[PDB]
Design a protein around this ligand. Sequence first.
Ligand SMILES: *[B]([O])([O])[C]([C]N1[C]=C(C([O])=O)N=N1)[N]C(=O)[C]SC1=NN=C([N])S1
Length: 357
Amino acid sequence: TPKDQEIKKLVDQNFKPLLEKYDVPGMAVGVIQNNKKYEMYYGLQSVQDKKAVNSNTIFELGSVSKLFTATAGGYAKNKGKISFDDTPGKYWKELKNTPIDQVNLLQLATYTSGNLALQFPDEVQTDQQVLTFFKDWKPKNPIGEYRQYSNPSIGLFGKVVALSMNKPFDQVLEKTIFPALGLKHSYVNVPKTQMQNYAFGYNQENQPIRVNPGPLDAPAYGVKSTLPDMLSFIHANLNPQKYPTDIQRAINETHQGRYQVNTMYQALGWEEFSYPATLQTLLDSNSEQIVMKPNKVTAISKEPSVKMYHKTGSTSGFGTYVVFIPKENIGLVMLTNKRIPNEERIKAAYVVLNAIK
Ligand SMILES: *[B]([O])([O])[C]([C]N1[C]=C(C([O])=O)N=N1)[N]C(=O)[C]SC1=NN=C([N])S1
């Protein structure tokens, strides 16, 4: 049996059943193998409109947006606009000589400030309130020693990256990073002319919704993209030597592991693992303990010879999973317009990628 003919069958067997299981209106699953793209579309981007999911459908990426923030940081570092040893007050002058100005940019990007939780407080909304939050910040855990997964943390990193490139963060992605990556329909702000392609998300009561504005939302969870674009992004991560040298350096930078929390290596944005990874290793990265709680980190001891990378992302109405394995030249993207459990996304991708080899 010609093996490429099995990719569609494998994705049908492992991803399609999730639509009925979780009452998901629409899903887009892509595989890239040996530079060939496979795109599988299911269901509806809009229930009320009876509009089909296809290659023009725009989905919210949720925390997979952090991978573009990381790539923007790697790009600015290669242009010499920042050093990861700098502190945020070098760029956001109102933070200079405040306690947060003891945390360096790598520590912000990789969640080890020692006192930043997953979300800003609900009452922090305006730019002024965001600044006040960081000026009022005081340490808790020893800086650099504890990982607590955090939108404020990588959000501040993103704001600093934009300051170093003298452009607002949305313009850094839309005018510099996305074009260098060859993405055609990736947005921080979806323009009027693409709104008809923007899927509705659906909440747990199946009501149609889209992501709401929030503080430093764009660098933490505010990018929207299509399946073809996300496959191109995976392609760039699988083969950065084909891309312009500056974006090539940026991508490499996001692949470097910085520290570990047992079997999970924290890279810039990406989570990294020894390949082959056990299923439970991949599931653990999304455990309550790793996602919601502080964990003391360690230095990398085992430097994986062959690596794989992944990232989950969610908004209230959307689920995302991306995973790639350089030495197998394969990767996978899943986009849904209703959240489904992280472990389902990870497991389905594991079965598919293992069966293709
Ligand atoms: B990110 O996706 O990791 C991040 C945090 N997170 C984790 C999960 C999970 O485990 O299901 N869900 N969220 N995502 C966000 O912070 C999204 S914030 C918002 N999403 N929709 C809004 N209207 S605000």
